[PDB]
Design a protein around this ligand. Structure first.
Ligand SMILES: *[C@@H]1O[C@H](CO)[C@@H](O)[C@H](O)[C@H]1NC(C)=O
Ligand SMILES: *[C@@H]1O[C@H](CO)[C@@H](O)[C@H](O)[C@H]1NC(C)=O
Ligand SMILES: *[C@@H]1O[C@H](CO)[C@@H](O)[C@H](O)[C@H]1NC(C)=O
Lengths: 48, 48, 97, 145
């Protein structure tokens, strides 16, 4: 999931745009992926 | 060290056991923090 | 073919060649001519082999020596006003040999 | 109303489009061979056109810029040097002309150019906002503790 960024491939974003502009996109990717991991962890806690 | 210029010098002087480079722990007290900001590549020292 | 021609057109009637559907390797221009003016404006002369261009125009015309320095964006002169005028927002390079 | 540990003022004259170029982590020969700011830059850049001091009749070719550099420029680096850029494999270093080009080119300015080609004067103010003894302040009152 692109999570609202240019692409869902971090390595593609890195190799395509400059650091200070791809920064927003990679931060968006972090906010999406970490939050998804949070949902997974919480659901695993409930199941446990 | 010369991180982003800002030359730093560290020193702690003690008549330690005196054999050679010793074992007991010793912290380092800063003396001067000076922002040189020049190119630096080689090292040499002056004798008496 | 634009560097191995034998009848490079005059500046008043500058032949404009359209280049498309090809891989733009610049070593072929590097080896063909001992340049004297390789000034680049929109792109870096070192950085030409890592950029993909939608279209490339190669305008070739033999001209005098000082007219080489005359031909540049935001310039003036008998050639720069009546024969060929380079746009100020020129994204490209010129080659003079 | 702030306190900064140390202030560095860097000054140079650059063209109108290069004002858009000059910014933390951008692209362009000036940004990668002439001057590069850190990605986490903390400071101000000041730009105002100077067509009265950098322009004269018959032109003025005093200034310079570098276009040929072996690599990218690390932030705040004085890479001042006159070394011919190598092209292909020839060790040249002796004669100008073919595949031996100068690292820098004249920054000629005339009073009659376009806005994008005008002599803008640029100075950049760099600040260090860290927990360290400051040196510069503004308005002050010293109420007793
Ligand atoms: C033209 O092509 C021939 C054959 O490859 C080559 O030897 C010659 O150097 C070329 N000349 C120019 C000016 O490109
Ligand atoms: C461009 O046109 C001129 C007209 O005289 C010709 O001499 C030249 O060979 C042409 N260049 C091409 C077709 O690449
Ligand atoms: C600055 O120091 C680095 C460290 O070796 C060196 O690679 C670089 O060439 C130096 N730049 C100069 C001397 O302009």
């Amino acid at each position: 999931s692109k999570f609202g960024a240019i692409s869902s491939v971090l390595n593609d974003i890195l190799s395509r745009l400059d650091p200070p502009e791809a920064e927003v996109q990679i931060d968006r990717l972090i906010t999406g992926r970490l939050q998804s991991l949070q949902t997974y962890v919480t659901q695993q806690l409930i199941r446990a | 060290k010369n991180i982003d210029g800002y030359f730093k010098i560290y020193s702690k002087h003690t008549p330690i056991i005196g054999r050679d480079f010793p074992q007991g722990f010793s912290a380092l007290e800063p003396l001067v923090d000076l922002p040189i900001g020049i190119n630096i590549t080689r090292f040499q020292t002056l004798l008496a | 073919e634009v560097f191995n021609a034998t009848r490079f057109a005059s500046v008043y009637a500058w032949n404009r060649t359209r280049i498309s559907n090809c891989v733009a390797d610049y070593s072929v221009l590097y080896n063909f001519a001992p340049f004297f003016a390789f000034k680049c404006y929109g792109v870096s002369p070192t950085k030409l082999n890592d950029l993909c261009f939608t279209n490339v125009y190669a305008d070739s015309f033999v001209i005098k020596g000082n007219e080489v320095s005359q031909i540049a964006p935001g310039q003036t002169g008998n050639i720069a006003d009546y024969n060929y005028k380079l746009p100020d927002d020129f994204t490209g390079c010129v080659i003079a040999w | 109303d702030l306190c900064f540990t140390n202030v560095y003022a860097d000054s140079f004259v650059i063209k109108g489009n290069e004002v858009s170029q000059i910014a933390p982590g951008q692209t362009g020969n000036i940004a990668d061979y002439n001057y590069k700011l850190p990605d986490d830059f903390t400071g101000c850049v000041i730009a105002w056109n100077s067509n009265k001091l950098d322009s004269k009749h018959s032109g003025n070719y005093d200034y310079w810029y570098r276009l040929f550099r072996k690599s990218k420029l690390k932030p705040f680096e004085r890479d001042i040097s006159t070394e011919i850029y190598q092209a292909g494999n020839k060790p040249c270093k002796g004669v100008k002309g073919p595949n031996c080009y100068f690292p820098l080119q004249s920054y000629g300015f005339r009073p009659t150019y376009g806005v994008g080609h005008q002599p803008y004067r640029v100075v950049v103010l760099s600040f260090e906002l860290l927990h360290a003894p400051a040196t510069v302040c503004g308005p002050k009152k010293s109420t007793n503790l």
